[PDB]
């Protein structure tokens, strides 16, 4: 097959900016490119078709381009909502190949989760288990780091983490770490914490509670 | 317009055989090239087969010939991709797409999509378990609250608050498959700590596969 590799990965821009992402073919696949959009939960769509001709309805600010075996999209003017994952794609050849993705996210200011940490529920508690959870709210950027710590000794791999995709009205994630024990173990100690730790939090803040049904 | 729509994805053990369809309105599929792409959860987007109905020829992915057949009936303008020999692998969302002919020889029209989910393990419907305020200390500004919807097979499970009236800072958190094969997920929501008990808060949890709907009512504790 022909293997079309895209670079970058993922990438952050602020509103206003010119950003590129780049396809490169494994072969000469000559003008057989497309170039798709797919925002989450959504089938793709496509914004241009043979290299770099645009597709009815696109916005002007979408452009692609070929140079020997390396296809571009270039989007001028970054609007918030173009928020998505870009693919190409050469239909040169059967199989039709796509390249990996490229997550274009909007870069924003550094804001701070607030914490909140929710102790298990007893109907949850009766089928013996004990699910606390830590609720990270609207936060930038992405990367935070959640900490378990039960009476002070830090919890390793009982812990999941699932993050919210970008709000669109203001650009946050947010995100829930999820310890989850047996109601005989979580009965054995005191103090349930979630130790927070984020870019725009000045010091780790610590939400914790005390167990029990009390 | 010109849609194109699929239809008959779900569960399936493995090593079972499936049909999915793919109706297409506004264009004859005569005319056309029709395909069906995949996508696994999270992963990029992969080619399965491509039919000409005219003269019926068919073209496979190597991890499908053989096990899959890709057909059409002109005359019901709706095509079929027949899936036997399934594997855990085969768990992708199912479009089908035109390639345009006419011009731009890319995919322009894509359907919805179908989830074909290919598992030995059975529908469980979801343990929806509130995650209340006041944890140790009660009131202060913004509170937060929720509900915790756990261990359901397959997906989706859908969640609304108040029945569809609290949309408002309104978070549902991507399911996430815990070790024993079943997901888990949390809708949460953030109020003021003045309505906390003027309020009712309940949380709309429906999981179509089970056929459960659950309605849990979210209110605050002490300790």
């Known amino acids: 097959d022909i293997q079309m590799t895209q670079s970058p990965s993922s990438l952050s821009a602020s509103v206003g900016d010119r950003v590129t992402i780049t396809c490169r073919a494994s072969?000469?696949?000559?003008?057989?490119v497309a170039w798709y959009q797919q925002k989450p939960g959504k089938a793709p769509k496509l914004l241009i078709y043979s290299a770099s001709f645009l597709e009815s309805g696109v916005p002007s600010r979408f452009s692609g381009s070929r140079s020997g075996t390396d296809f571009t999209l270039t989007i001028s003017s970054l609007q918030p909502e173009d928020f998505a994952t870009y693919y190409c794609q050469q239909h040169y050849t059967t199989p039709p190949t796509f390249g990996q993705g490229t997550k274009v996210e909007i870069k924003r200011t550094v804001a701070a989760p607030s914490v909140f940490i929710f102790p298990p529920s007893d109907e949850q508690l009766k089928s013996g288990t004990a699910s606390v959870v830590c609720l990270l709210n609207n936060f930038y950027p992405r990367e935070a780091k959640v900490q378990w710590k039960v009476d002070n000794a830090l919890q390793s791999g009982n812990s999941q983490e699932s993050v919210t995709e970008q709000d669109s009205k203001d650009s946050t994630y947010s995100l829930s770490s999820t310890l989850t024990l047996s109601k005989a173990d979580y009965e054995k100690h005191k103090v349930y914490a979630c130790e927070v730790t984020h870019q725009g939090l000045s010091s780790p803040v610590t939400k914790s509670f005390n167990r029990g049904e009390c | 317009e010109v849609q194109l729509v699929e239809s008959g994805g779900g569960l399936v053990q493995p090593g079972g055989s499936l049909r999915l369809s793919c109706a297409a309105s506004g264009f004859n599929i005569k005319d056309t090239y029709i395909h069906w792409v995949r996508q696994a959860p999270g992963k990029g987007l992969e080619w399965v087969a491509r039919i000409y109905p005219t003269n019926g020829y068919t073209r496979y992915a190597d991890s499908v010939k053989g096990r899959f057949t890709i057909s059409a009936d002109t005359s019901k303008n709706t095509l079929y991709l027949q899936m036997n020999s399934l594997r855990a692998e085969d768990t992708a969302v199912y479009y089908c797409s035109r390639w345009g002919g006419d011009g731009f020889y890319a995919m322009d029209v894509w359907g919805q999509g179908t989830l074909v989910t290919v598992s030995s393990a059975s529908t469980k419907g979801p343990s929806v378990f509130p995650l209340a305020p006041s944890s140790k200390s009660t009131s202060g500004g913004t509170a937060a609250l929720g509900c915790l919807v756990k261990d359901y097979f397959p997906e989706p499970v859908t969640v609304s608050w108040n029945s569809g009236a609290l949309t408002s800072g309104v978070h549902t958190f991507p399911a996430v498959l815990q070790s024993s094969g079943l997901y888990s997920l949390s809708s949460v929501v953030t109020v003021p700590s003045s309505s906390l008990g003027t309020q009712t808060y309940i949380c709309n949890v429906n999981h179509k596969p089970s056929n459960t709907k659950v309605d849990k009512k979210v209110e605050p504790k002490s300790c």
């Open positions: 072969q000469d696949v000559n003008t057989a």
